[PDB]
Amino acid sequence: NMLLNYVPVYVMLPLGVVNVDNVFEDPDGLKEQLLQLRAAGVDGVTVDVWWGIIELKGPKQYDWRAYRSLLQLVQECGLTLQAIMSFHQCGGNVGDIVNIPIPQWVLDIGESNHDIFYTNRSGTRNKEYLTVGVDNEPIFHGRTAIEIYSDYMKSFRENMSDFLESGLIIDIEVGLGPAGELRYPSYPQSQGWEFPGIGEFQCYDKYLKADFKAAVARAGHPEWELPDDAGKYNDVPESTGFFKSNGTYVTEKGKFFLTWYSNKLLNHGDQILDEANKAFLGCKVKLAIKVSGIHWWYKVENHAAELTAGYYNLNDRDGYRPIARMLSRHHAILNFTCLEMRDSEQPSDAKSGPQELVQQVLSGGWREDIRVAGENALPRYDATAYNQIILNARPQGVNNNGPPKLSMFGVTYLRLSDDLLQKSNFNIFKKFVLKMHADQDYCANPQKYNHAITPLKPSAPKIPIEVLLEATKPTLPFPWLPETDMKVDG
Ligand SMILES: OC[C@H]1O[C@H](O[C@H]2[C@H](O)[C@@H](O)[C@@H](O)O[C@@H]2CO)[C@H](O)[C@@H](O)[C@@H]1O
Ligand SMILES: OC[C@H]1O[C@@H](O)[C@H](O)[C@@H](O)[C@@H]1O
């Protein structure tokens, strides 16, 4: 039955639906919009549950009231919800039209210890997310960074227990870095970065620097230092000593560094997912993480932008499949934040391969047998963008004889706004939804399309780093259709 080809669609809510003062500003206005979404067949909505808003007053001083009101309204409107545990700041990344810092009490600690922030070679501290360097340092009034994240999720679970039991929440997206994605803040607009700059390594805080020095010493090269020839944010690879042909990135020193740098992210994600699994154990919800889509420089040997962001991906080394393998033990979903782009839409001097990157990432996930989801990177309202999203959702089209061999677990659309509801735009959006649903009407019971959610089980045993890195072996991607068989047209 065709319903087996159904891929659910979710819509991200406006940034700041509950403001920095923890107030659900305009319920009536949101309601009108939500009702239009429900009428259009949208399965659910997505929202940031901001750490800086909820635990503002002080350690474990949570206030869930405003969010309880929002969830209540969402439920009343007949929509499901994807909740993002947002442990990051809103404001310095593309589209961030509102400023929401992390808890002030944490920022106060940052005044006496600047090394709790990601730091670049020049010494500039980025305050949008706590460096992985302090994940296990008990410097926050007795707690470590991971314990803070853990306590937060447990409080959410307990205080929103009625919504969880009633099945309102479909999945919990655990924020793991800038913009909620598992990556280093290598391309900060707040520091002057501009596409398609290669970005900069963010491993200069005292915690990461010390870990590196100890590591190279144990490797027999105590004299090795962090990269000093990688250039600046807006450089091009060929103008740097680190990324040029036969440059530092290909030397024993460079390879060791890149492995160390990317490994920190894998472990960061694995340890926090462990806590998320314990916090939501038994609940009918799934776990998910977000991976950034860094398509610029993907078509040159150095893959410079990916490397500075923490994804050690080269033409002969898969830097994404190891992440997918790590996710399997947690039975988590890999959410890829860039599915609507086409190579031809990118300037040629950027050497961008968004289409190829998507194929590589989704294929790796399916090969590791995990579920994969995604979202468009930039606001788009045209047919071509929707058709590309639909192609990626079902790479080999629909199957009239049963379920498709390949399909994404869901797609989240960024973002709900007055522009989207404009007559003509919303008209196209409705067709996008219909096509994602494979020409079927909105289906309220997820079980009908094999998306039933069972109680979250405990995570499987820890997978050693060496086994994770075996996933770096390059593999051929699954075959992709040149265009979707379920086009929106125009
Ligand atoms: O509201 C979710 C999330 O949205 C923004 O980050 C997006 C980004 O704009 C996209 O281009 C892509 O990278 O996915 C990101 C995460 O969904 C905000 O910048 C971020 O703070 C917020 O959590
Ligand atoms: O915010 C950065 C964005 O700027 C836009 O002008 C470009 O078209 C995007 O490709 C880029 O990601």
Coordinates of C-alpha atoms and ligand atoms in Angstrom, one line a residue:
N1 CA 0.0 0.0 0.0
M2 CA 1.2 3.5 -1.0
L3 CA 0.9 4.7 2.6
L4 CA 4.2 2.9 3.2
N5 CA 6.0 5.5 1.1
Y6 CA 4.7 8.3 3.4
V7 CA 7.4 10.6 4.9
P8 CA 6.2 12.9 7.6
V9 CA 6.7 16.7 7.4
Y10 CA 7.4 19.0 10.4
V11 CA 7.6 22.8 10.5
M12 CA 9.9 24.7 12.7
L13 CA 8.2 27.4 14.9
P14 CA 9.3 31.0 14.8
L15 CA 12.5 31.7 16.8
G16 CA 11.5 33.1 20.2
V17 CA 7.8 31.9 20.5
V18 CA 8.6 32.1 24.2
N19 CA 10.8 35.1 24.8
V20 CA 14.0 35.6 26.8
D21 CA 11.8 36.5 29.7
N22 CA 10.1 33.1 29.6
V23 CA 6.8 34.4 28.4
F24 CA 4.6 32.7 25.7
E25 CA 4.1 36.1 23.9
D26 CA 1.3 35.6 21.4
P27 CA -0.8 32.4 21.8
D28 CA -3.7 33.7 19.7
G29 CA -1.5 34.6 16.8
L30 CA 0.4 31.3 16.9
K31 CA -2.9 29.4 17.1
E32 CA -4.2 30.9 13.9
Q33 CA -1.0 29.8 12.2
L34 CA -1.0 26.3 13.7
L35 CA -4.5 25.8 12.5
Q36 CA -3.5 26.6 9.0
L37 CA -0.7 24.1 9.2
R38 CA -3.1 21.4 10.5
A39 CA -5.4 22.1 7.6
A40 CA -2.5 21.8 5.1
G41 CA -1.8 18.3 6.3
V42 CA 1.4 19.0 8.2
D43 CA 2.2 16.2 10.7
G44 CA 3.9 18.3 13.4
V45 CA 6.0 21.2 14.4
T46 CA 9.5 21.7 15.9
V47 CA 10.7 24.0 18.6
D48 CA 13.9 25.0 20.5
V49 CA 13.6 24.5 24.3
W50 CA 16.2 27.1 25.2
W51 CA 18.5 26.4 28.1
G52 CA 19.2 30.1 28.5
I53 CA 15.6 30.8 29.2
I54 CA 14.6 27.9 31.4
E55 CA 17.6 27.7 33.8
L56 CA 18.2 31.4 33.9
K57 CA 17.8 32.3 37.6
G58 CA 20.5 29.8 38.7
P59 CA 21.6 26.2 39.0
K60 CA 18.6 23.9 38.8
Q61 CA 16.2 26.9 39.0
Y62 CA 14.0 25.6 36.2
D63 CA 10.7 27.3 35.0
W64 CA 8.8 25.2 32.6
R65 CA 5.5 27.1 32.8
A66 CA 5.6 29.0 29.5
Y67 CA 6.7 25.9 27.6
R68 CA 3.8 23.9 29.2
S69 CA 1.4 26.5 27.7
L70 CA 2.9 26.2 24.3
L71 CA 2.8 22.4 24.3
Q72 CA -0.8 22.5 25.5
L73 CA -1.7 24.7 22.5
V74 CA 0.2 22.5 20.0
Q75 CA -1.7 19.5 21.3
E76 CA -5.0 21.3 21.1
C77 CA -4.3 22.0 17.4
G78 CA -3.8 18.3 16.6
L79 CA -0.1 18.4 15.8
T80 CA 2.8 16.3 17.2
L81 CA 6.1 17.9 18.4
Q82 CA 9.8 17.6 17.9
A83 CA 11.6 19.1 20.9
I84 CA 15.2 20.4 20.6
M85 CA 17.3 20.5 23.8
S86 CA 19.0 23.8 22.9
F87 CA 22.1 24.3 25.0
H88 CA 23.4 27.0 22.6
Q89 CA 23.0 30.7 22.1
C90 CA 20.7 32.1 19.4
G91 CA 22.0 35.2 17.7
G92 CA 25.3 34.8 15.8
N93 CA 24.3 32.4 13.1
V94 CA 22.4 32.9 9.8
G95 CA 18.8 33.6 10.3
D96 CA 19.1 34.3 14.1
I97 CA 16.7 37.3 14.4
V98 CA 16.6 37.1 18.2
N99 CA 19.2 37.1 20.9
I100 CA 19.0 34.3 23.4
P101 CA 22.3 33.7 25.4
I102 CA 23.0 30.7 27.5
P103 CA 22.3 31.1 31.3
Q104 CA 23.7 34.3 32.8
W105 CA 25.1 32.4 35.8
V106 CA 27.2 30.3 33.4
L107 CA 28.4 33.5 31.7
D108 CA 29.4 34.8 35.1
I109 CA 31.7 31.8 35.5
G110 CA 33.0 32.6 32.0
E111 CA 34.2 36.0 33.3
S112 CA 36.7 34.4 35.7
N113 CA 37.5 31.4 33.4
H114 CA 37.5 32.4 29.7
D115 CA 38.6 28.9 28.8
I116 CA 35.1 27.5 29.1
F117 CA 34.5 28.9 25.6
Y118 CA 35.6 27.7 22.2
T119 CA 38.8 29.7 21.3
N120 CA 40.6 30.3 18.1
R121 CA 44.4 30.7 17.5
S122 CA 44.1 34.5 18.0
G123 CA 42.5 34.1 21.4
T124 CA 39.0 35.2 20.6
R125 CA 36.4 33.5 22.8
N126 CA 33.1 32.4 21.3
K127 CA 30.3 32.4 23.9
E128 CA 27.6 30.6 22.0
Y129 CA 28.5 27.1 23.4
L130 CA 30.6 25.5 26.2
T131 CA 33.8 23.9 24.8
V132 CA 33.9 20.1 24.8
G133 CA 37.0 20.8 26.9
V134 CA 34.9 21.2 30.0
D135 CA 32.4 18.3 29.4
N136 CA 33.8 16.6 32.5
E137 CA 35.3 19.5 34.5
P138 CA 33.3 20.0 37.8
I139 CA 33.7 23.8 37.6
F140 CA 30.1 25.0 37.4
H141 CA 29.1 25.2 41.1
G142 CA 30.1 21.6 41.6
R143 CA 28.6 20.3 38.3
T144 CA 30.3 19.3 35.0
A145 CA 28.9 20.6 31.7
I146 CA 27.5 17.1 30.9
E147 CA 25.8 16.9 34.3
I148 CA 24.2 20.2 33.6
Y149 CA 22.8 18.9 30.3
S150 CA 21.7 15.7 32.0
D151 CA 19.9 17.4 34.9
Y152 CA 18.1 19.6 32.4
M153 CA 16.8 16.7 30.3
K154 CA 15.6 14.8 33.4
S155 CA 13.7 17.9 34.6
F156 CA 12.1 18.2 31.2
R157 CA 11.1 14.5 31.3
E158 CA 9.5 14.8 34.8
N159 CA 7.8 18.2 34.3
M160 CA 6.4 17.3 30.8
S161 CA 5.5 13.7 31.8
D162 CA 1.8 14.1 30.9
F163 CA 2.6 15.4 27.4
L164 CA 5.1 12.6 26.9
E165 CA 2.6 9.9 28.0
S166 CA -0.1 11.3 25.8
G167 CA 2.3 10.9 22.9
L168 CA 2.6 14.6 21.9
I169 CA 6.4 14.5 21.6
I170 CA 7.7 12.4 18.7
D171 CA 11.5 12.9 19.2
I172 CA 14.1 14.7 21.3
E173 CA 16.8 16.5 19.3
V174 CA 19.8 16.8 21.6
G175 CA 21.8 20.0 21.0
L176 CA 25.5 19.2 20.8
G177 CA 27.1 22.5 19.7
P178 CA 26.7 25.8 17.9
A179 CA 23.2 26.1 16.3
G180 CA 22.5 22.8 18.1
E181 CA 24.7 20.8 15.7
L182 CA 27.6 18.4 16.5
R183 CA 30.4 20.6 15.3
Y184 CA 33.0 23.2 16.2
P185 CA 32.1 26.9 15.6
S186 CA 34.6 27.1 12.7
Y187 CA 32.6 29.6 10.6
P188 CA 31.4 32.4 13.0
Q189 CA 29.6 35.3 11.3
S190 CA 30.1 37.2 14.6
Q191 CA 33.9 37.1 14.0
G192 CA 33.7 38.2 10.3
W193 CA 33.5 34.9 8.6
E194 CA 31.9 35.0 5.1
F195 CA 31.0 32.2 2.7
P196 CA 33.0 30.4 1.4
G197 CA 35.8 31.0 3.8
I198 CA 37.6 27.8 4.9
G199 CA 37.0 28.7 8.6
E200 CA 39.4 28.2 11.5
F201 CA 40.2 25.4 14.0
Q202 CA 38.6 26.0 17.4
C203 CA 40.9 24.0 19.7
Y204 CA 42.9 26.7 21.5
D205 CA 41.2 26.9 24.9
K206 CA 43.5 25.7 27.7
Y207 CA 41.6 22.5 28.3
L208 CA 41.8 21.2 24.7
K209 CA 45.4 22.5 24.2
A210 CA 46.6 20.6 27.3
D211 CA 44.8 17.4 26.1
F212 CA 46.5 17.7 22.7
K213 CA 50.0 18.3 24.2
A214 CA 49.6 15.2 26.4
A215 CA 48.3 13.1 23.5
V216 CA 51.2 14.0 21.2
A217 CA 53.7 13.3 24.0
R218 CA 52.2 9.8 24.4
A219 CA 52.5 9.4 20.6
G220 CA 56.3 10.0 20.9
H221 CA 56.2 13.6 19.6
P222 CA 56.0 16.0 22.6
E223 CA 57.3 18.7 20.3
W224 CA 54.2 18.8 18.1
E225 CA 52.1 22.0 18.3
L226 CA 48.5 22.9 17.3
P227 CA 48.3 24.1 13.6
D228 CA 50.0 27.5 13.0
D229 CA 49.8 27.5 9.2
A230 CA 46.1 27.0 8.6
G231 CA 45.3 30.6 7.7
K232 CA 42.3 32.7 8.7
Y233 CA 38.5 32.4 8.5
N234 CA 38.2 33.9 5.0
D235 CA 41.2 32.3 3.4
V236 CA 41.1 29.9 0.4
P237 CA 42.9 26.5 0.9
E238 CA 45.6 26.9 -1.7
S239 CA 46.9 30.1 0.2
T240 CA 47.6 28.2 3.4
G241 CA 50.5 25.9 4.3
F242 CA 48.2 23.4 6.1
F243 CA 45.7 22.8 3.3
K244 CA 47.8 23.3 0.1
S245 CA 48.8 20.3 -2.0
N246 CA 51.3 18.2 -0.1
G247 CA 50.6 20.6 2.8
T248 CA 50.6 19.9 6.5
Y249 CA 47.2 18.1 6.6
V250 CA 48.8 15.2 4.8
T251 CA 51.8 14.8 7.1
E252 CA 52.1 12.5 10.1
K253 CA 51.6 15.5 12.4
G254 CA 48.6 16.8 10.5
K255 CA 46.9 13.4 10.3
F256 CA 47.4 12.9 14.1
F257 CA 45.9 16.3 14.8
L258 CA 42.9 15.9 12.5
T259 CA 42.1 12.5 14.1
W260 CA 42.4 13.9 17.6
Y261 CA 40.2 17.0 16.7
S262 CA 37.4 14.9 15.1
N263 CA 37.5 12.3 17.8
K264 CA 36.7 14.9 20.4
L265 CA 33.3 15.4 18.7
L266 CA 32.5 11.7 18.4
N267 CA 33.0 11.2 22.2
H268 CA 31.2 14.5 23.1
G269 CA 28.2 13.2 21.2
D270 CA 28.4 9.7 22.6
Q271 CA 28.7 10.7 26.3
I272 CA 25.8 13.2 26.1
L273 CA 23.6 10.8 24.2
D274 CA 24.2 8.3 27.1
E275 CA 22.7 10.9 29.5
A276 CA 19.8 11.6 27.1
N277 CA 19.0 7.9 26.9
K278 CA 18.9 7.6 30.7
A279 CA 16.7 10.7 31.1
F280 CA 14.1 9.5 28.6
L281 CA 14.2 5.8 29.3
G282 CA 10.8 4.2 29.0
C283 CA 9.3 7.2 27.2
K284 CA 7.6 6.8 23.7
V285 CA 10.1 9.0 22.0
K286 CA 13.2 8.7 19.8
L287 CA 16.6 10.5 20.1
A288 CA 18.3 12.5 17.4
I289 CA 21.3 14.7 16.8
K290 CA 22.0 17.3 14.1
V291 CA 25.0 17.2 11.7
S292 CA 25.8 20.4 9.7
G293 CA 26.0 20.3 5.9
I294 CA 29.4 21.9 5.0
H295 CA 29.3 21.7 1.2
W296 CA 32.0 24.4 0.4
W297 CA 35.4 23.0 -0.7
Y298 CA 33.9 19.5 -0.8
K299 CA 35.1 19.2 -4.4
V300 CA 38.8 19.8 -3.7
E301 CA 41.1 17.2 -2.1
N302 CA 41.5 19.1 1.2
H303 CA 37.8 19.4 2.1
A304 CA 39.1 22.4 4.2
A305 CA 35.8 23.7 5.6
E306 CA 34.6 20.2 6.8
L307 CA 38.0 19.7 8.5
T308 CA 37.9 22.9 10.5
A309 CA 34.4 22.1 11.6
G310 CA 35.5 18.8 13.0
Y311 CA 34.4 16.4 10.2
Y312 CA 37.6 14.6 9.1
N313 CA 36.2 13.8 5.7
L314 CA 38.5 13.3 2.7
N315 CA 38.1 11.5 -0.7
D316 CA 39.8 8.5 0.9
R317 CA 38.4 8.8 4.4
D318 CA 34.7 8.9 5.3
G319 CA 34.3 11.3 8.2
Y320 CA 30.5 10.9 8.5
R321 CA 29.9 7.1 8.7
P322 CA 31.7 6.9 12.0
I323 CA 29.1 9.3 13.4
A324 CA 26.3 7.1 12.1
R325 CA 27.9 4.0 13.7
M326 CA 28.1 5.8 17.0
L327 CA 24.4 6.7 16.7
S328 CA 23.4 3.0 16.3
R329 CA 24.2 2.1 19.9
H330 CA 21.8 4.8 21.0
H331 CA 19.2 3.9 18.3
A332 CA 19.3 7.6 17.4
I333 CA 18.4 9.4 14.2
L334 CA 20.9 11.3 12.1
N335 CA 19.4 14.7 11.2
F336 CA 21.2 16.3 8.2
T337 CA 20.6 20.0 8.1
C338 CA 21.0 20.7 4.3
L339 CA 18.9 18.8 1.7
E340 CA 17.4 21.4 -0.6
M341 CA 20.6 22.6 -2.4
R342 CA 21.8 21.9 -5.9
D343 CA 25.4 22.3 -7.0
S344 CA 24.5 24.7 -9.9
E345 CA 23.1 27.2 -7.3
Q346 CA 26.5 27.6 -5.8
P347 CA 29.2 30.0 -7.0
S348 CA 31.9 28.1 -8.9
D349 CA 34.8 29.5 -6.9
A350 CA 33.4 27.8 -3.8
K351 CA 33.9 24.3 -5.1
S352 CA 30.6 23.3 -3.5
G353 CA 29.1 19.8 -3.8
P354 CA 25.9 19.8 -1.6
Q355 CA 24.3 17.1 -3.8
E356 CA 27.3 14.8 -3.4
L357 CA 27.6 15.5 0.3
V358 CA 24.0 14.6 0.9
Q359 CA 24.3 11.3 -1.0
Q360 CA 27.4 10.4 1.0
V361 CA 25.9 11.2 4.4
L362 CA 22.5 9.6 3.8
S363 CA 24.1 6.5 2.3
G364 CA 26.4 6.1 5.2
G365 CA 23.5 6.2 7.6
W366 CA 21.4 3.7 5.7
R367 CA 24.5 1.4 5.4
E368 CA 24.9 1.5 9.2
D369 CA 21.2 0.7 9.5
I370 CA 20.1 3.8 11.4
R371 CA 17.3 6.2 10.6
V372 CA 18.1 9.5 8.8
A373 CA 16.1 12.7 8.7
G374 CA 16.9 16.2 7.5
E375 CA 15.9 19.9 7.0
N376 CA 16.5 22.6 4.4
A377 CA 19.5 24.9 5.3
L378 CA 18.1 28.1 3.9
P379 CA 14.5 29.6 3.5
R380 CA 13.1 28.5 0.1
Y381 CA 9.6 28.7 -1.3
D382 CA 10.1 27.6 -4.9
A383 CA 9.3 24.3 -6.6
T384 CA 12.9 23.4 -7.5
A385 CA 13.9 23.4 -3.8
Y386 CA 10.9 21.3 -2.8
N387 CA 11.6 18.9 -5.6
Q388 CA 15.2 18.4 -4.5
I389 CA 14.0 17.8 -0.9
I390 CA 11.5 15.2 -2.2
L391 CA 14.2 13.5 -4.3
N392 CA 16.4 13.2 -1.2
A393 CA 13.5 11.8 0.9
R394 CA 13.0 8.9 -1.5
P395 CA 16.2 8.7 -3.7
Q396 CA 14.9 5.8 -5.8
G397 CA 11.3 7.0 -5.9
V398 CA 8.1 5.4 -4.5
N399 CA 7.4 1.7 -4.6
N400 CA 3.8 0.7 -5.7
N401 CA 4.4 -2.8 -4.4
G402 CA 5.3 -1.9 -0.9
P403 CA 7.8 0.3 1.1
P404 CA 10.6 2.0 -0.9
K405 CA 14.1 0.5 -0.4
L406 CA 15.4 3.9 0.7
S407 CA 13.6 6.7 2.5
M408 CA 14.2 9.3 5.1
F409 CA 12.5 9.1 8.5
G410 CA 11.2 12.6 8.2
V411 CA 11.9 16.1 7.1
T412 CA 11.7 19.4 9.0
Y413 CA 11.0 22.6 7.1
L414 CA 12.6 25.9 8.2
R415 CA 10.7 27.9 9.0
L416 CA 7.1 29.0 9.9
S417 CA 6.7 32.7 8.9
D418 CA 4.2 35.1 7.3
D419 CA 6.1 34.6 4.0
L420 CA 5.2 30.9 4.0
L421 CA 1.5 31.5 4.7
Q422 CA 1.4 34.0 1.8
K423 CA -1.3 32.7 -0.6
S424 CA 1.0 31.6 -3.5
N425 CA 3.8 30.4 -1.3
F426 CA 1.5 28.4 0.9
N427 CA -0.1 27.0 -2.2
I428 CA 3.1 25.4 -3.4
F429 CA 3.9 24.3 0.2
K430 CA 0.7 22.3 0.2
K431 CA 1.8 20.4 -2.9
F432 CA 5.2 19.7 -1.2
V433 CA 3.4 18.2 1.7
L434 CA 1.1 16.1 -0.5
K435 CA 4.1 14.8 -2.4
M436 CA 6.1 14.0 0.7
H437 CA 3.0 12.0 1.7
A438 CA 3.2 10.3 -1.7
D439 CA -0.2 11.7 -2.8
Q440 CA -1.9 10.4 0.3
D441 CA -4.1 12.4 2.7
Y442 CA -2.7 13.4 6.1
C443 CA -2.4 10.2 8.2
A444 CA -2.9 10.7 12.0
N445 CA -1.9 7.2 13.1
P446 CA 1.9 6.8 12.5
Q447 CA 1.5 3.1 12.8
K448 CA -0.2 3.0 9.4
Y449 CA 3.0 4.0 7.7
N450 CA 5.3 2.0 9.9
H451 CA 6.4 4.8 12.2
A452 CA 5.0 3.5 15.5
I453 CA 7.1 4.6 18.5
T454 CA 7.8 2.1 21.2
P455 CA 9.3 2.9 24.7
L456 CA 12.9 4.1 24.5
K457 CA 15.2 1.2 25.4
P458 CA 18.6 1.5 27.2
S459 CA 21.5 2.2 24.9
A460 CA 23.7 -0.7 23.6
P461 CA 27.2 -1.3 25.0
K462 CA 29.9 1.3 24.3
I463 CA 31.6 0.9 20.9
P464 CA 35.4 1.4 21.2
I465 CA 36.9 4.2 19.1
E466 CA 38.9 1.8 16.9
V467 CA 35.7 0.0 15.8
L468 CA 34.1 3.4 15.2
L469 CA 37.0 4.5 13.0
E470 CA 36.7 1.3 10.9
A471 CA 33.7 3.1 9.4
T472 CA 36.1 5.6 7.8
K473 CA 36.5 3.0 5.0
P474 CA 35.1 4.7 1.8
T475 CA 32.1 3.1 0.2
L476 CA 30.1 3.8 -2.9
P477 CA 26.8 5.7 -2.4
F478 CA 23.4 4.2 -3.2
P479 CA 22.1 5.1 -6.6
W480 CA 20.2 8.4 -6.9
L481 CA 17.4 9.2 -9.4
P482 CA 18.2 12.2 -11.6
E483 CA 14.9 13.8 -10.5
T484 CA 12.0 12.7 -8.3
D485 CA 9.0 10.8 -9.6
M486 CA 6.8 12.9 -7.2
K487 CA 7.4 16.4 -8.5
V488 CA 5.6 19.5 -7.3
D489 CA 6.0 20.9 -10.8
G490 CA 6.2 24.7 -10.3
Ligands
LIG1 O1 15.5 26.5 15.3 C1 16.4 25.5 15.1 C2 17.8 26.1 14.9 O2 17.7 27.0 13.7 C3 18.9 27.7 13.4 O3 19.9 26.8 13.0 C4 19.8 26.0 11.8 C5 20.4 26.7 10.6 O4 19.8 28.0 10.4 C6 20.3 25.9 9.3 O5 21.0 26.5 8.3 C7 20.9 24.5 9.6 O6 22.2 24.5 9.9 O7 20.2 23.9 10.7 C8 20.4 24.6 12.0 C9 19.8 23.8 13.1 O8 18.5 23.4 12.8 C10 19.4 28.5 14.5 O9 20.6 29.2 14.2 C11 19.6 27.6 15.8 O10 20.0 28.4 16.9 C12 18.3 26.9 16.1 O11 18.5 26.0 17.2
LIG2 O1 24.4 33.5 5.7 C1 25.2 33.0 4.6 C2 24.4 32.8 3.4 O2 24.5 34.0 2.6 C3 23.7 33.9 1.4 O3 23.8 35.2 0.8 C4 24.2 32.8 0.5 O4 23.3 32.7 -0.7 C5 24.2 31.5 1.2 O5 24.7 30.5 0.4 C6 25.0 31.6 2.5 O6 24.9 30.4 3.3

